[PDB]
Amino acid sequence: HMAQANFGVVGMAVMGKNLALNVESRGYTVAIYNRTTSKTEEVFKEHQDKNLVFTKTLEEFVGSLEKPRRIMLMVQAGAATDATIKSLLPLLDIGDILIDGGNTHFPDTMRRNAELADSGINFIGTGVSGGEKGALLGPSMMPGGQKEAYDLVAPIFEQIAAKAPQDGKPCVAYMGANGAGHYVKMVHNGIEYGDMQLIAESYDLLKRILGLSNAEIQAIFEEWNEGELDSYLIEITKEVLKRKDDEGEGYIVDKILDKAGNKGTGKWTSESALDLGVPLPLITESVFARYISTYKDERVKASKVLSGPALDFSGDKKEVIEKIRKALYFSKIMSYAQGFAQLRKASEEFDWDLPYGTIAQIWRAGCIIRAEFLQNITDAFDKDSELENLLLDDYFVDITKRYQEAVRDVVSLAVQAGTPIPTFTSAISYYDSYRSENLPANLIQAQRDYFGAHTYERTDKAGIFHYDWY
Amino acid sequence: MAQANFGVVGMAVMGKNLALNVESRGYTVAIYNRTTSKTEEVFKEHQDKNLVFTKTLEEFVGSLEKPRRIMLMVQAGAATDATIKSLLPLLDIGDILIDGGNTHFPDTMRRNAELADSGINFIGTGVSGGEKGALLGPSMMPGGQKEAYDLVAPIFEQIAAKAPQDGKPCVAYMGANGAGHYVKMVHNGIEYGDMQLIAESYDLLKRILGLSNAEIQAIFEEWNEGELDSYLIEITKEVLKRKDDEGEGYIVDKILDKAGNKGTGKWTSESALDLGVPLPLITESVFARYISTYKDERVKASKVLSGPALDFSGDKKEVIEKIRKALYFSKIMSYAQGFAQLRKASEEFDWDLPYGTIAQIWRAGCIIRAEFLQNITDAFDKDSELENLLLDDYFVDITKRYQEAVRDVVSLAVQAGTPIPTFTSAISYYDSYRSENLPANLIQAQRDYFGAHTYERTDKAGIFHYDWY
């Protein structure tokens, strides 16, 4: 059983297990190890016909792997992963390649990558999207690390990766050195928060303003998805709106408490954007939208005390349903423009030469945010790899021009009717700000110099200036 | 030469003045600064005063009466760490060290723990009020152990601004370890909000009502007579007056639209994301700062990205009042957000923050000095466990009376292509906060659908998963 296995996996929770099964199905012997043996063993018996190699101790596991050893870690992010890494280090050899496919915070990977390079060991921080089903059938993957070591891992990753239905291209490509992989995966997770919120706002509008029924709302997303929006998330939405309550009358969607899921890791993209000095209103608005929703108890109380308009809709339903559709797409565009500009900045800061156009290609399948318009992002970067912002490319220039009007009315209609659209309003503000040649930042600048002499720059000559306000 | 009663390190704008404040209370004040040149430059001018000029840290530390009371006003982070590292050896059991800068609170929290049982008294304190504040009387936000605090209170009270309504000094005990610096970071957070709300109104007036600086300076004057009466509005019309010192035209037109920022605003937002606190407005103004540094692409994008060039054809004075309401309204949203974060932070760190007091000490020597802070104090006198300020009557009323106007201002400004990030934030927040039901229901449904994440129900307790297949 010594040196038999081509690839190894540590962590036999559903994720690791599924991955090991994925890799096995592509024609490999794969060694599986878990801390709690009864899990490993439990996996072995269910999958004895497969070419999995059962291992009881780290020793057996490391010992079972062909060299250079390719080991994927699918354990709990944080202390656990460092624990696991520390347990393997003695037993490993120079040139062996460790792979962390957990939902890891990028600095963790940047630190680990560097530490282990001193010990000779290669380290590939790799984002694995698509959940348990993807891990088994086809994930989208975002690896980063030593490029030489990755090249030796790439074949497997490429065989197991999800295949884009438009061209069967594997949803995996090298991101860059150290932690570039995990950083791309983060922005991805941020972006997901944006889309989900943007859909939420769309739903909220049709439901509340146009008094639409779930069934009516289903039909709309159904249609919208035939067009340019076309996205798995929209497909999920029309699927969820079909379903009956399993414990009572009506729709499950109307029975699910409006309190959003525990933070969690979704805040990271916004933390990074704050850190790098990058404007990311949309995604950050999405996060707080989640947050504010967890204040349900407070909202109930406020709902009974604070006044809002009690308007009643009289416009044209067909006209508005189409303006919101434009609002949706325009806003979605704003989010990506921001998220792709974040990547561009992080790519300078850390020196990564991030392949922006491929990122979009490898998001086409095996993840949540998969959508037809991702191609337009690739087109854009093909045209100019150095493109500062998605908005400045022929396709998005056009969409924004023909669509901006609708946003505005959607904004006025919602705001007048008192329906909360934090991300829609944000999208249109990012727009008008980005194109504003001059901003009133001049006044802020004056204020800070006035009270604290923080010094400003001038519009007319180069240099640093402090006006004498006293 | 143990002569001096108090000592100030770092003779830039803040440390300089602070040392002059302390001096004006009839003490003799050690002045050290790392760059000798400025220490002598301050001694030489203020000969008349009782300043003890020193050149090495050992001098300065020797030259203080025991127990020594030392207050640092140095640039935050590395700059402050090294300054304190130098100092600790030189000091004696019973001495008092004060970090008066904009230190990121975790630095202080850690420092406090480190320094706790080594017999040196440490205070992390926030100081608001800028140069005039530091000179004449600043807002002070001391945190640390109560015994430490009690030794500096007498002199803090003396140098602190006095509230004009009651003469109560704008300094109080904030809480254990980092409580103080934390409070000041929220001060600066709210500050960025106010400023972006101010700037946006400048824009609206200048760009939709096509108003001149004198016309606008006049508008901010009249506003400061009303309920808006506040330091920031005040310094605005003060700015709008001044003329270029190097050319024709108004100074405020020759400053480049690129906001500098020194961390505190960013830190507030970071803490909000960290605590689960919804802090849209301040975070929107942080990003408003960011996107302003993107001047180059804004210049580029202005020539390619189309937008409304539609003229304003309505009643000017009617729409000016409408903006004033929205400005008042939005300020209230910000402070609500700010205070709720402080609530959450308080219970995270076991601080027991005096919310009412915090409003009280903000009445003066404070950049976010504003008349309507008293109202915040009432609200907390009325119920110290208040969850959000919007629930309090005084504010329930204002929102009810001003919300319709906000909506009109937001509508006009969007249709006129003029960017109002914090204004749009204000009404969104208010509209979310008052909804019994948000579309989080759909979101949750989605999360359970693709990722098995589970969810709560509207009708029964427990966590549930839906067999979506």
Ligand SMILES: NC(=O)c1ccc[n+]([C@@H]2O[C@H](COP(=O)([O-])OP(=O)(O)OC[C@H]3O[C@@H](n4cnc5c(N)ncnc54)[C@H](OP(=O)(O)O)[C@@H]3O)[C@@H](O)[C@H]2O)c1
């Ligand atoms: N300005 C305001 O409106 C205001 C308001 C409240 C609080 N604060 C806080 O008060 C503190 C200082 O006030 P400031 O803004 O007037 O000054 P600052 O520019 O932030 O800090 C400069 C002071 O720190 C010293 N310093 C800078 N870098 C150093 C280094 N690397 N090593 C050792 N010393 C160093 C400088 O000495 P050199 O002369 O040698 O450079 C100078 O005395 C800061 O922490 C600031 O956040 C400022």
Ligand SMILES: Nc1ncnc2c1ncn2[C@@H]1O[C@H](COP(=O)(O)O)[C@@H](O)[C@H]1OP(=O)(O)O
């Ligand atoms: N501190 C740790 N040390 C070693 N392995 C761990 C640790 N924490 C979690 N794991 C492993 O990671 C996987 C669980 O990840 P998650 O918590 O994200 O579902 C499991 O295989 C678990 O093994 P075990 O089955 O022995 O607990």
Ligand SMILES: O=C(CO)[C@H](O)[C@H](O)COP(=O)(O)O
């Ligand atoms: O603490 C202060 C006032 O409250 C300082 O003036 C501070 O530096 C201003 O904030 P920033 O420079 O980040 O805009």
